[model samples]
Target chain A: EPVLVATTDGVGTKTLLALEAGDVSGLGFDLVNHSVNDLLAQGAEPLFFLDYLAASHLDEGVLAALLASLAEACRAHGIPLLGGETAEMPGVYREGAWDIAGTLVGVVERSRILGPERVREGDALLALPSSGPHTNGYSLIRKVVAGQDLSAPVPELGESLKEALLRPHRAYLKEFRLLWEAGVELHAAAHITGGGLPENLPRALPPGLGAEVRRGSWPIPPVFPYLQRLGGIPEEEMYRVFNMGLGMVLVLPQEAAEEALKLVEGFLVGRVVPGEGVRLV
Target chain B: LEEPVLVATTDGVGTKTLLALEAGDVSGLGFDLVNHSVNDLLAQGAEPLFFLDYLAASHLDEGVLAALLASLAEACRAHGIPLLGGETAEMPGVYREGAWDIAGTLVGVVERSRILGPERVREGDALLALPSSGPHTNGYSLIRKVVAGQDLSAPVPELGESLKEALLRPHRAYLKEFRLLWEAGVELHAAAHITGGGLPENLPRALPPGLGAEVRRGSWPIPPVFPYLQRLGGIPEEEMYRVFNMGLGMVLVLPQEAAEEALKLVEGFLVGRVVPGEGVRLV
Candidate 1:
């Protein structure tokens, strides 16, 4: 049996949204998902969730909505929404922005873990699609999406940019079953997050195993490209700043290549080779 | 407590907002958690006559604040309790927008003979179990992982009849329910409100040494959410026994014949029998 462990998470830059929206809608959701996904990365599902909700006043309605969201999400995931703490402090975080985090107890077996030790040349790299922006790249996205007429639906965008940027996270728990049934094993898997493909890809690769990503493989969603042009970020820095089009990556054996993609919303984006480091062509 | 006659405990909304966000449901949180804390008092055979809360966050948005108070008032009126004076803070860089923790302190007067605590344990004491609606605000962090990619606004087929909404739907105040049982003047001996420690852990906390319990498997309805977590985490049966309420909220240690009468007023069933040992086993 795989050993399962628990982990904690703080919603990174997304914490700033409550200040901007003057609401707690995104704060709790972002915090909950970040914690849940961290556990999912280790092949463990969340058993229960805990929160340290700090605030200035105990507003029942606002707090209830927050809890409703917490309970709703936890129920969908089929985990327990256990009790937590509510601390009201005079001084702590910035006004209007709540600092939210999720603590999760997850279970996994030691034998099922995928690490960098198993990386090899010619290993297949499969990229999973993200559910909107995920948790990373929000600082720049915030900088770009600021001052936009989010209320008016853009002709080009099916929905408002705000809706798109605030898209909830994708859960890869069910996909694990697909991979297991097909007998597909990944050497390592890393969620391509805030620092994009260029920074995140190198984390799970063997020291000597380099990666090459084909630039033309996937279509860049309008949201990311628009944000890039809006914020005036450089191309190289852009890749280093966001998940790009990649949400998660799996370094799998060649024989299991097709099945991995079938299980996840992704594609075979690159391969491993002996070189200086990971590079996108 | 100032005197042995009064018992008080406090809690806040926590991040149930996250559950609301994921499901796009926010109505339940405004009042549920405070009510949840209030219910804890009822389990100890207390009236919960008055309640106070401490709320604070960075910037105070009046609309969000009003909603919270509105829900609080609703629950208070229903329970015949008053929402007494409370304090709120508007601090900068302290709490996120629309995020507030509710700390509710309940004051209830209890008679020393009626105070439910340890020392009521005797061999062959029957264990009467009561049903909890769902994960009662104890394990959201883990819940998010078990049901990945789903949230509050979005409905989940497996949940069956708005289970999330119901779970976070303010813990049942149980004042009326408890009053019925209390008026009967039944010898409670000892009673335990199932909380974070779950049944296995909480029950023993209320009993004397060498008091063991044999819980029947088909006792109460186990919520879907918990079994899913157990299966996903591959958690040992013993651990679940210690950590979760497992659908049993309060346990009463009393004479075996009292079981049927207690159930008539409150919705409860015989879960097990207390023996001369330690802990509980669900056979």
Candidate 2:
């Protein structure tokens, strides 16, 4: 068939914090980059991006900065920013909070979609390092850091808190291009997000196969521990909500494993075999 | 000897739909915005040809908002007007939850020479009065303060219908009848509609030098919503004239000879006249 296509997005409640704190830069990056990452998971170089910004009143300076950040992200990724709309309606919107949404269109060859159709139950798995929060984990994060505001120049000072949340989502478009040029025929892939291992890994399993993930190879970010300590949130809930460290993974034949790691910095997280589900160790 | 002049203006419903939803009488909100904008243009002898709207909500119900659009569409078609482009948006977190707003733009063109400004109003031209429903859409600031306290759906026996119904009727469209007079060469020298500002203020804007309106007392019918609101809100009658349209909708200026034709075809009737005075009269 033609290119297999998919679109995904995240609600940027972090933007709500930025607005409240009177900060503008990171929010812009988070909003656009979140959509870009979703597009990249399908191994499709996103074509164009569209956006919507709503406000109770016009904040021209903040809006200009937002557009600038969006332009920079687009240029860096070599993706074009198509036309979008900015709307202002008095009273209907809360004073500071406004919702933003983005839709991206991209194409991936039918064979490129991350399905295990080609696997014969002995494929190895590769997990890539994540930049930071990578635009997931807000509801629990917010509950953990309740009463503290996101806009008060706060991210700049927190020990590791700032570094962890400020970590940018990885742009794997170039890495994928590099790996493809080197002839890495990946069999299946998973965009690890909200559901983490329990939810994302099973999606790659063929009818009679499963992935046995060894968590020892992946290190959880400190922010998860900090939030767990502060909010007393359970370990399982933390895994369920946040993207701990690794961002995305691809399961392919054991032969491509060494070359794939040589092409980019990633760890072998698991191996696939004839079974029924994704198991955590 | 001369063609009629045309005047025009445009505005929209804004972001008040959130309140309308809470208030639960959303029937004619969009229609009211459209017709009011059309009527503003009509007060200057302008006939509406096309109207366009932009509706942005968190997510469109299609049933609720679409029904309003359909009614407005039918009304526009009824007036021989076409809708050009309508943009619908679903913006989460942009619009307040379940709250939306609409903006409209209108276009009207008249013959080169027929521009009915105050230039034609002479001292003897009579003020022929027409009645209105309620204040079209202005004075909502106080409306929010007033009705926010009372139960909006609570029916005041005197008003008959619920307060929500009384407050939300669409503005009366005067295009069909107004077109009749414009073509008949009715010398409508000056015309004013009692919009946000009542007769005393709006009529004078259309008057020529050294002349004003002689509006008769008890000359038009005031709807029950006004009285119940005045008591509930403690609003003064004089101030009411400043804030509401009262019962009077429109007033026109013409020679005595045209009165017979006007009485025959005018949708509403005469209760005042234009004459030599400092300002409007209700004596």
Candidate 3:
């Protein structure tokens, strides 16, 4: 029997910064990829995608650009952009502000569904790198970088602040499929999103089983360190709020770790342990 | 998994939010969202399983948010649909102060054999209709424009109520009526939920190619609100039917015999009949 899984998420305040930058190039990818990754966490492949875009006064050009990006992302993933709703509510939305959200419905075999139930102690934790912030912590990011020139290049980042912040959230479907095709027995997986590794990784583990992530095992991306230094944010808070480089975390039997790492570009960041919550060592 | 076919729909309350905001009673908007979605599922002959909502505001008012969710819960509970989960976004710079928007997604299940559509429709089927409370979440942008600067609280002599009371009536859900028809063994060939495009556009969708509808002009009572808005806006009669529901919300196409049985069990009237043509004709 095949089971259906549906997930809904919004792009958050990232839209504001993208609108300010006047280039919404990757925001569509950000939306679709973020949703596709959520479906992959449940062992489901996307069937179709839908969106809701609302603004005070919808500029046709802006709407077209947004939809074009959205359609591009959907096509890249082999999913149809089935339909969407665009609303222009004058008094409800501010003059130029826009809000966009997506709903993705995917299907997986009942036996292949991924979650904490299948996870066990001693499972290996595999990590995949994220492209910068990937649609979370923008409210805090905007607060930290307020009044600064976003176009000005920060030497450490190798790109302007706006470029680093606007990178699309990575879709892990292709990477996950690589392991799936190679016959990797994945016990569970988690998408490191809003709460980063601390909040999201534990969701993939069953009760009485936690993760012990060896700190410094994987390289943290520069944007994170730069934000930490610029905002004077503490080390712990940075990991809690941002992915810090790891985008997708996979839990597998220790014996299968070598095969999964070979199938996809990932790091063996941690292991399942006898505990309750994620511990950074 | 039982392998049920899923039907999903998403919609917003539109500028009706402005009226709700002005009247300071947004509770009806919650029902408007749920009922509207429920009727959409019912039109497809599917039973609603659950619902989710996206509520975004510039500055969230705790009381208003509570009212919206509580009302949504009430509607979902009444119809045996779970208020599964939803996202409440507070984007300060996006939404204007004291303004908000709500959109909802409803998912329902129907066995493949039980699914209904234009394929099931045939000539000579009766077009039965269930009355609407008011506009039911469409054409509000025009509605608002027509009555701008007028006191919404003032009584409208023709409508028999204040402008606010008549216009802000919650959308009607036809799930119960649909259930009654199902229980009565009425063979519902197809059905349509009259929303934004009104009867002219929506009814034709329930019909197959080469089949159209012939609706009797005075078969159903036109809610005074429609005529009132028409006179106020000086909107032509045909355009009025295109925008508003024109007093009928749900239309069902069934065999003439089944229509008689359905009429007995539900407060519906035979508004028209399926004809061999295209689109709908108002006789």
Candidate 4:
């Protein structure tokens, strides 16, 4: 029997900066990949996707570019752009302001569904790199970079601030499929998003179980430190808001860790321990 | 893998929110939102399994948020559909002050064999009309322009209630009516939920290619709001049918025999029949 899995999410305040920069090119992938990764966290393959776009007034060229980017992302994952709703609410939305939200419906065999139930003590945690902030913590990013030049080149990022900020969210479907094909039994998985590793990693562990993460096991993207230093945000608060460079964390038995790592380019970042929350060592 | 096929749809409450907000009673918009999607899924013969909503505002008001969610839960409870989950966003710069917008997505399931649409419709299939509860979330942008500077609380002679009461009547959901027909074993060929585009645009969708509709004018009573808005706006008759539902909300197409049985079981009007043509003919 197959079970249906669905999730809905929005691109948050990132649209504000994208609109300001006159380039909403990656926002579509930001929405689609953000949704795809959410479904993949539950061990489901996306079937089709639907979107909702609302604004005070719509620009034809901007609308066309947004939908085109959405179609491109859907095509990459082999999911149909099933249907969508485009609304122009003058009195409701502010002029030139847009919000994009998407819902993805996917399916997984009932016997193969992944969750905390399959997680156990001694399971190893793996870390997958993110493209950037990956659609999370943009509200803070906007605040930190306010009144600064978005097009200025940062020595640390080696790219313009705008380029670093607008990198589309990365989808992990291909990697998940590869691991499955290689017969590596994935116990559970968590998408590192709005709530970073400290908050997301514990969701993949059983009630009594927790995780022990090694701080330097994986490289942190430059954008994280750049935003942190500029805003004077504490390390704990930083992990609570941003992905901190890791987009997803996978939990599997220690025995399958080597096989899983070989199939996907990820680092062995931590281990599932008998506790209640994530412990950074 | 053998499994029930799922049908999904997404829609918003349109500019009706402006009216609901002005009226200071934002309660009915939730019913308008949920029922709108339910009726859409009903057209595909799918019973709603669950629903999700996306509500965005410039600033979050605890009272307004509570009222909206309460009404959404109420409507979902009425139809036995789960208000599975939804997102509530406060996008400070995206929305105007005191303005809120809502959009929803509904996912439903139907046995593959029982799916309905144009492929199942036939020539001479009788069209049955289910009356609407005034405007039903469409044409509100025009409605606002027409009624601007008028007293919404004042009672109109034609409609037996205040303009506010009549205009804000929650959109009626036809799930119970659909169940009545289905449980009675009525053979339904297809159905259409008349929304933004009205009859001419919506009716043809339920019909097969080369087959059109003959909707008998005066076969169903036009709600007073339609004529009231028409006379006030100085709108043409053709434009009235093109914009508003006039009266009908959902139209059903069935074999003549089933249509006869359905009318007896449900309070619907035999307003039209499928004909050999290209578009709807209001005879």
Candidate 5:
């Protein structure tokens, strides 16, 4: 029997912060791409997407823009935006406030579902580059920058804090599909979401095997270090709280590493070893 | 491919939830959201299979969240639908201080042969009106307008309940009704759910092209809140019909003889008839 995978998610307070900054263009990505990556974790490609948009009072212009962006994103991933619900609840939301949540339905053959069961010792771990923090850690971000001016530009990042914070959640569906069709066998996969690598990496490993991630194997996006120092957060806590630089992780046999590297644009960051939990070295 | 065709719909409870939050009555919003979507699929002759919910607010209120899920679970159990999955987020800056938004998605299956609606509707069919418990999750924007400065807890003598209960009454589900009808071998032509646009807007959607419906307004019981809001807000008859469902939350079209048999099996008002025309006309 063919199996169906379902997921529901929404961007947190980042949506309000993005709206306050006057550009919600990437808001839909925060919802669609996040869910798409989640479906990818289970080896399922998206079939369709349904969105729910709620605002204090529905703004036709903003709603149109939100929907157009959602349509464009879903179409780019070869998934149809079948239909969704729009609401104007002034009393439930504050003025000029809006949020979007999406539910995606996808499918995979029963024999091909990816999970920790397929993971083994000595499997190579690959990390894909991220657009930014993706959707997590925003609630902490608002508090971290409560007193600062977000519109001011930071020369190091080459953009204002607002612009960097609101960058779209990058989708890995296309790149992963290309690698899959090239006959690369992935033993397991994980989308680094709310829990970062410490929490998400273990999901791709079987009971006795854990992952060993090599530090300095890839460049961390500038925004990560900037936010860490500005908030006075410890370097240790940062890995658990944010995606750092990697968004998707794939576990594979050492033999397939060369072919996979030739197909997907990513770096060899770690390996599955005989351990109980993931360790950063 | 799956054996049965799949149907899915998503929706929110609107701002009636603000009143729910104020009254500490978030218990019903869950049922309201789930039931509303259940009826949407039921209108298309689908049997609900599972539901997924998304609940977000400025801060997490454990008690309120529990109450909401309890009611949602109860409603799902009553309809034989599973509460499959959900997500709850404490979004501090996005929503108002105490306001919470609730949205749900329902997925169901319908047999390929028994799919109902417009194409199956025949002329001279009867339009039956199923009574609503209250507003059934619509017209809250106007309800708030009518009660703008008034106290929601204040008793409404005419309605025999507080304005809150009258306004927040959970939407009734027709799953059991449809199941009963189908079990008894009563064929259903089509059913339309009365929602934000009232009967005039939703009824037409269930009709086949080149056909309209003639509804008798006086046949069904008009809930007290309709007339109350009408007088308080000075809402015209046509506008009220456009915004609220009046008193009937659903309309079922069946063949004349089947309608008589259905009337005996269920308690409802025969409110209209299928006619040759486009759109709906009120008498």
Candidate 6:
């Protein structure tokens, strides 16, 4: 039986920051790429992408840039930008503000669908790096950094906060494709999203199976550390809220780990253990 | 070999959302969107399979949001379709205070041979019309203009309902009715969903090239709300039919030979017939 996979995602409050900076450029990429990653989790290749953009009023330049970015993302992934809706609501939507929500539909073979059933004890978890915030936790970021200049360069971050925060959400479609085409059996995959590692990892963990994640296994991005210090957020809350540095986690057999690492540039960040839930050591 | 074809459509509720919000009665907006979209696909003889929605607001009021979603789920269940998935965004800048906007996409399937369209419409076919519940989420921008200073909660004797009730009545779905006709083995040629464009505009969509319709002006009773708008706005008769559904929300074209049988089976007015002309002629 062939299966059709679909996912819906929105750019959330990142549009607010993008608008404030006058750099609403990558908002479309954030939506499409974020949606594509969800499709990737099911071992499905992107087929068609649809978007819904609503605002009090739309600017031609802003709308064009969004469509262009969407076109670029769909083209790069070899998927068609099938169709979408643009709603211009004068009184309903706020001034100078718009929202982008994308729906992606893709197909995967029945036998190739990935889920929690494939994960088992002793499996290794390999993590791919995230570009930046990648369209999550901005509401908190705004609240935490209230009234502070986001454009100023911090000596620790090595770049302006705006530049660091606005990085396009990296799509793992190409990397996942390379691995799958090379015959890497990805038992289960987890997309680190709103819940970050603490919540998302268990989604790929089967019943009675937990995760043993090694802290300091990968370098924490400066943005996350800086934000954590500034907000005075507890370490566990930080791990529960942010992606840290790992974006996508792949669960597969320990024996095939060496071969998989050779195909992708990632280190083993955790492992499947004989318990439930997740523990960040 | 039969190939399955997919039909998809997307639409918003227009300014009718403002009415729902201002009235504090969004109890039916979801039904309006789903029913409207289902009728859109039914125009092509496609059975709706699933729907996805998008809702945006400055700040979500849980009571209103839950009611809207619950209404959508109820509508989907009533029609025997799936509420597949959707997105809800709370953008402080994108929406005005106490306001929200909604849009949706529907996907349906049809057998290639069973697809109804203009190519199937033939001259001398009778037009059967299904009565509309109300405006059905169209012409609301003008509707606001007509009732600008009038009290929405005030009862109107001529219209036989409060202005708010008359305006917020959810759109009706034709899937069950169409299914009944199809099961009765009625020979149907095509269907038209009277939406943003009334019969004057939407009917032509189902007519073949070089073919038009001869709709009898008094063949069906114009709903009370429409005539009220007419008298209140002093709007032209042509503009009335152009912007509003008048009374019929849907129309079907079928051979005259089956007209009597269709009328017996389908509870609709025998409004008009296909004519050998270029456009719809309101006789």
Clashing pairs in 2: A21-A151, A99-B93, B5-B114, B5-B115, B5-B116, B126-B274, B127-B273, B127-B274, B215-B281
Cα lDDT of model 2 by residue, A1-281, tens digit: 21323343434555554565455566556656666666555567676665556577668887887778767777777776654445565567767656554445566765455565766587888887776556667545655676754333433335544445555566677767777778787877776766776677677667888888787786666666666777897867766776667677778778897789899878898899777776766
**C-alpha TM-score for every candidate:** 0.52, 0.53, 0.84, 0.90, 0.89, 0.83
**Candidate achieving the largest DockQ:** 5
For model 1, the local distance difference test gives 0.65
Could you tell which candidate, 2 or 4, scores higher by TM-score? 4
Docking class of 1: incorrect
Q: Which ten-residue region of model 3 chain A has the weakest summed lDDT?
A: A1-10
DockQ for every model comes to: 0.09, 0.11, 0.41, 0.52, 0.54, 0.39
Error of 6 at A229 (Å): 7.0
In candidate 5 the C-alpha lDDT for residue A231 amounts to 89
**For candidate 4, lDDT tens digit of each residue in A1-281?**
22467877889889889988778998889999999998888888899899888887888988988899899999999999887888887877888889988888888865446899999899999889898898888889999999889999999999877899998999998998898777788889999987788888888888999999999899888888998998899999888899987889999888788888778889898899888888789
lDDT of 1 by residue, A194-247 (tens): 577766778788777778988867656667777777788888887887776676
Q: Where does model 5 exceed 4 Å of error?
A: A1-3, A140-165, A206-210, A226-233, A256-258, A273-277, B1-3, B112-114, B117-123, B144-165, B184-189, B208-210, B229-236, B276-279
Better of 1 and 4 by lDDT: 4
How high is the TM-score of chain B in model 5? Answer: 0.94
* Most accurate candidate by TM-score: 4
Q: Is candidate 1 or candidate 3 better by lDDT?
A: 3
Give the fraction of reference interface contacts each candidate recovers. 0.22, 0.26, 0.44, 0.62, 0.69, 0.51
Tell me how far the alpha carbon of residue A251 in candidate 5 is from the true structure, in angstroms, after superposition.
3.1
lDDT of 2: 0.66
A50-96 in candidate 5: lDDT tens per residue? 99998887777778778888888888888888669888877777788
Provide the TM-score of the second chain in candidate 3.
0.95
TM-score of 2: 0.53
Lowest-lDDT window of 10 residues in candidate 6 chain A?
A: A1-10
Worst 10 residues of 2 chain A by lDDT: A1-10
Tens digit of per-residue lDDT, candidate 6, span B34-106: 9998998898888887887878777788998998898889888888877877877776655778777777877
